[PDB]
A paper describes a structure:
Notable among these are the resistance to inhibitors of cholinesterase 8 (Ric8) proteins, which regulate G-protein biology in species ranging from slime molds to vertebrates and, in contrast to GPCRs, act on monomeric Gα subunits. The interaction of Ric8 with GDP-bound Gα stimulates release of GDP, leading to the formation of a stable intermediate complex of Ric8 and nucleotide-free Gα. Although the GEF activity of [name] and Ric8B was initially thought to account for the ability of these proteins to positively regulate G-protein signaling, mounting evidence suggests that the Ric8 proteins can also serve as ubiquitous chaperones for Gα-subunits. To gain mechanistic insights into the function of Ric8 and its interaction with Gα, we solve the crystal structures of both apo [name] and [name] in complex with the C-terminal fragment of transducin-α (Gαt) attached to a [name] ([name]) tag.
To assess the conformation of the C-terminal region of Gα in the absence of intramolecular interactions we solved the crystal structure of [name]-Gαt327–350 alone. Although the Gαt327–348 sequence could be traced in electron density, it largely lacked secondary structure and the conformation differed markedly from that in the complex containing [name]. Thus, binding of Gαt327–350 by [name] induces the formation of an α-helix by Gαt335–346 and/or stabilizes such a structure.
Author numbering: 2 to 393
C-alpha cells in the first residue's frame, strides 16, 4: 500500500542511502513531508513485483537499463520537467531515460566500472588482462592475490566478455535488433574463456561475491578489484592507498563496461507524484542534494552540469569516464532483463564448471534472443483460498 502524504524511496544498498536520507530530512523541514529511504535486497526485481499490483515505493532508484521494462509494464509515471530544468542536466542523460517517446525517470549520474588497484602491492597495474595470471603467481608466492571482484553479477564480467567483440543486442541506425544477440560470438567466447581460465587456474574463486571481493581488497589481501564509484568510500576508510584506472585490455582491445545512468523513477501508482517531482527536481538534483548523496557514496559523473564541473576534476571520475567512453550505454529495452538473466546464468555455470564456456554461451544466446521473455503481471501475486476473504 502506497501511503499518501509521505515519500518512500528505494535505492540499492551499495549507494548513498544515508546521504539521500539527509536530503529527505531537508525536504521534511521545508514541507513537513516525511521521506523514508529504504534499500531492499533484489531491488530491481522487487520493485516491478510489487509495483505491478499498485504498491511499492514512490520513487525507485536504479540504473536506467531496467526502466524500459518498468515503463512497458505501466509502472512509471511520465515525467515532464520544464525545459529550463532539463537544460541543467547533460542532454544525453535524458535520452537514457526516454522510452517510447516519454521521459520515464530523472537521470542522476553516469556509472562505469573501473580497475581499482592497491598502489603499495601493485604500483604499475596491468595494462592487459593477459598479464594478470603471471601477476597473481608472483603475488601468490608472497601470500597475496592479484584480483578479486564480484563474480555473481554479470555486470562485472561483461567488460571482459565485450572487449573482443561480445555484445548484447546488435544495433544500427537508431534501432536494436533484439533477436541478434552477441554473447556467443568468438569475442564473447574468448572473454568468458579467459575469465573461466582465471578461475580454473586458481587465480580467482567462482564463489567470490561483492562482499568477499570488497573485504579482500580493503584489507590488503588482493591487489586489484573491479567496482564502481560507490565503492570508493569504503576504500577511503581503509588503510589502502588505491588508484582508479582504465580496465585492462583483452586481445589488444579495451574492456567495454556497460554504462549505467543511475535514475530516479516515480511509481505510476504513487499518490505523491507532485511531492516526488518537487523532491527530485528541487532538492536532490541540486548541488547541495547531490553533494549530500555523493559524500556518503560517490555517484560517479553526475548528470547535473553545475556539480559535474566540480567532480570532473577528480582523477577517479576521469578514469570512470575513460572506461565509460570505451564501453556502451546500456539499452533500456525490456529485453535487457532476459539478457542479464542469460549472461548471469552463463557466467555462473561456466565459472562453477557445470557447463563449458561454449555450452554456457550457446545457451545464453538462445535464452536472451528466443527462450526467455519476462512479463510482469498482477495475477502472479494472487493466492487463491477457499474463502474469497483469504485470497490475495
Ligand atoms: O549484474 C547485472 C546487473 O547489472 C547492472 O546492475 C548494476 C547496477 O547498474 C549498479 O548500479 C550497481 O548496483 O551494480 C549492479 C550490479 O550488481 C544492471 O543495472 C542490472 O539491471 C543488471 O541486473
Amino acid at each position: 500500500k502506497i501511503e499518501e502524504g509521505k515519500l518512500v524511496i528505494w535505492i540499492n544498498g551499495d549507494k548513498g542511502y544515508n546521504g539521500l536520507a539527509e536530503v529527505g530530512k531537508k525536504f521534511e523541514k521545508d514541507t513537513g513531508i516525511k521521506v523514508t529511504v529504504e534499500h531492499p535486497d533484489k531491488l530491481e526485481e522487487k520493485f516491478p513485483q510489487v509495483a505491478a499490483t499498485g504498491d511499492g515505493p514512490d520513487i525507485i532508484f536504479w540504473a536506467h537499463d531496467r526502466f524500459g521494462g518498468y515503463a512497458q509494464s505501466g509502472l512509471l509515471a511520465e515525467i515532464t520537467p520544464a525545459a529550463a530544468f532539463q537544460d541543467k542536466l547533460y542532454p544525453f542523460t535524458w535520452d537514457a531515460v526516454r522510452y517510447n517517446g516519454k521521459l520515464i525517470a530523472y537521470p542522476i549520474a553516469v556509472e562505469a566500472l573501473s580497475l581499482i588497484y592497491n598502489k603499495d602491492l601493485l604500483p604499475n597495474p596491468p595494462k592487459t588482462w593477459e598479464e594478470i595470471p603471471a601477476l597473481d603467481k608472483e603475488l601468490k608466492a608472497k601470500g597475496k592475490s592479484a584480483l578479486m571482484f564480484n563474480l555473481q553479477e554479470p555486470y562485472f564480467t561483461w567488460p571482459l566478455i565485450a572487449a573482443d567483440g561480445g555484445y548484447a543486442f546488435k544495433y544500427a541506425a537508431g534501432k536494436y535488433d533484439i533477436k541478434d544477440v552477441g554473447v556467443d560470438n568468438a569475442g564473447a567466447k574468448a572473454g568468458l574463456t579467459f575469465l573461466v581460465d582465471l578461475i580454473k587456474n586458481k587465480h580467482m574463486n567462482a564463489d567470490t561475491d561483492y562482499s568477499i571481493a570488497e573485504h579482500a581488497f580493503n584489507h590488503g589481501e588482493t591487489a586489484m578489484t573491479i567496482n564502481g564509484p560507490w565503492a570508493w568510500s569504503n576504500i577511503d576508510t581503509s588503510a589502502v592507498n588505491y588508484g582508479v584506472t582504465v580496465l585492462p585490455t583483452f586481445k589488444g582491445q579495451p574492456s567495454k563496461p556497460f554504462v549505467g545512468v543511475l535514475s530516479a523513477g516515480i511509481n505510476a501508482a504513487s499518490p505523491n507524484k507532485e511531492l516526488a517531482k518537487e523532491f527530485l527536481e528541487n532538492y536532490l538534483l541540486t548541488d547541495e542534494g547531490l553533494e549530500a548523496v555523493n559524500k556518503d557514496k560517490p555517484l560517479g559523473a553526475v548528470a547535473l552540469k553545475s556539480y559535474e564541473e566540480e567532480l570532473a576534476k577528480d582523477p577517479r571520475i576521469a578514469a570512470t569516464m575513460e572506461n565509460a567512453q570505451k564501453g556502451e550505454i546500456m539499452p533500456n529495452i525490456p529485453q535487457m532483463s532476459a539478457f542479464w538473466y542469460a549472461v548471469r546464468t552463463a557466467v555462473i555455470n561456466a565459472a562453477s564448471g557445470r557447463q563449458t564456456v561454449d555450452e554456457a554461451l550457446k545457451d545464453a544466446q538462445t535464452a536472451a534472443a528466443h527462450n526467455v521473455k519476462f512479463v510482469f503481471d498482477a495475477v502472479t501475486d494472487i493466492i487463491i483460498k477457499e474463502n474469497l476473504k483469504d485470497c490475495g
